[PDB]
Amino acid sequence: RARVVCYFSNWAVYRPGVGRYGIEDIPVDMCTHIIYSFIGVTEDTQQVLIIDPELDVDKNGFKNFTSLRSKHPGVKFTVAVGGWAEGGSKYSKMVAAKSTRMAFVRSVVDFLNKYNFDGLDLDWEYPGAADRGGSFSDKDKFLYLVQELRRAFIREGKGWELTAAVPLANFRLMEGYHVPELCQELDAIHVMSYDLRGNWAGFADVHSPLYKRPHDQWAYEKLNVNDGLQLWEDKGCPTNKLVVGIPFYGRSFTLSSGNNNYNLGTYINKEAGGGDPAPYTNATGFWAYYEICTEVDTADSKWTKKWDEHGKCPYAYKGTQWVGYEDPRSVEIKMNWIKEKGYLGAMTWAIDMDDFQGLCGEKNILIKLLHKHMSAYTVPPPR
Ligand SMILES: *[C@@H]1O[C@H](CO)[C@@H](O)[C@H](O)[C@H]1NC(C)=O
Numbered sequence: 001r002a003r004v005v006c007y008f009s010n011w012a013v014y015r016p017g018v019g020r021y022g023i024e025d026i027p028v029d030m031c032t033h034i035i036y037s038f039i040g041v042t043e044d045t046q047q048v049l050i051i052d053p054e055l056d057v058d059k060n061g062f063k064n065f066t067s068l069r070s071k072h073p074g075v076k077f078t079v080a081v082g083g084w085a086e087g088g089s090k091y092s093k094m095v096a097a098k099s100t101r102m103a104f105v106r107s108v109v110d111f112l113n114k115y116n117f118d119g120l121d122l123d124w125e126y127p128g129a130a131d132r133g134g135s136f137s138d139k140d141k142f143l144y145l146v147q148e149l150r151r152a153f154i155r156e157g158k159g160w161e162l163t164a165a166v167p168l169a170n171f172r173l174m175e176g177y178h179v180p181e182l183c184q185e186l187d188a189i190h191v192m193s194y195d196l197r198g199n200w201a202g203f204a205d206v207h208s209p210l211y212k213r214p215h216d217q218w219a220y221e222k223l224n225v226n227d228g229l230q231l232w233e234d235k236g237c238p239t240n241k242l243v244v245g246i247p248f249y250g251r252s253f254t255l256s257s258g259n260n261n262y263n264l265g266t267y268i269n270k271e272a273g274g275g276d277p278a279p280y281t282n283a284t285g286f287w288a289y290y291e292i293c294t295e296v297d298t299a300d301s302k303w304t305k306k307w308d309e310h311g312k313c314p315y316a317y318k319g320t321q322w323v324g325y326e327d328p329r330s331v332e333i334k335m336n337w338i339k340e341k342g343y344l345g346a347m348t349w350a351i352d353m354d355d356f357q358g359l360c361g362e363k364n365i366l367i368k369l370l371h372k373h374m375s376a377y378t379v380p381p382p383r
């Protein structure tokens, strides 16, 4: 009764060569809930914004995705609104008044009906975040949006789910999230237990450490997956609503000039913006799992791979380049820990970055680990 929640990126179809990943590449039976990412909100009218209408509507992307249920009927297919590229300001604007929230809610209900989705995942990054166009009143008004969406979903009578992707840093929680009230209205809380470190922090480190390391101090002291999920529990979310995110990508860095120390916490060249872009994702500071394994795991690789003994995550480096990520060892350790803690299940950002071509020898290796572990696991009653 555990969940395996798979985010699917609608832009991965534009990656070149073996990076191209479309609806037809989703390994549907490895997931229990699959989430088409992203739609947005319009700035002026507070309606659903279709972000790639040529793909999502003209080439039938949304409907090909939802019509996957014909052959896979036990899986739920929902849509996510928001995401990082959307920004936060349009969402703060949309929730600022009852009238604008109701315009959005109506728009969402029409959309979910039009494309036969099973519900909505909220991915506003983030209510209350000054760095993302937010402000103080977002905390109350996001809860109002959630309560209003749930009521609309009940009125529609189709049993749609409402879920949200959430951060784990305490300051983000305090600024944006009425935890007990939200966890009561939502079917699942998809915890973004990743991007916990990265170029923005000014030092090299793995980005999904499971436990605290000695170098973790002040706002990093509890910024790890174990303590972050414990914070969600402490603030009032039931264990059986929490789904733990697992990144199928690495955060990379360019090390500072003449720096020969490759340990966790080593200084970086922050102005570089991260490690150099990889060939398929073409994004500074961000490498898909398949981009990492094809470089690090080959027999004649010149990368050096190490292990964070406390964070339980791999990292690898070569030259000035350093990347922290998840591999099968670390993902196994996290699946066992989810079961130990009794959480609702596992989530992946994102299924389009697993080694779905088997470039490294084993097709869909990471999602197969999530599926193997979760499908044999019974979620216990709340703690
Ligand atoms: C949807 O499926 C049709 C029929 O197979 C295909 O031609 C089309 O390219 C698909 N569109 C997307 C976005 O996957």
Ligand SMILES: *[C@@H]1O[C@H](CO)[C@@H](O)[C@H](O)[C@H]1NC(C)=O
Residues within 6 Å of the ligand: 282
């Ligand atoms: C990679 O993205 C950069 C922006 O960072 C863009 O300028 C460049 O054209 C892209 N290259 C490819 C091959 O997509």
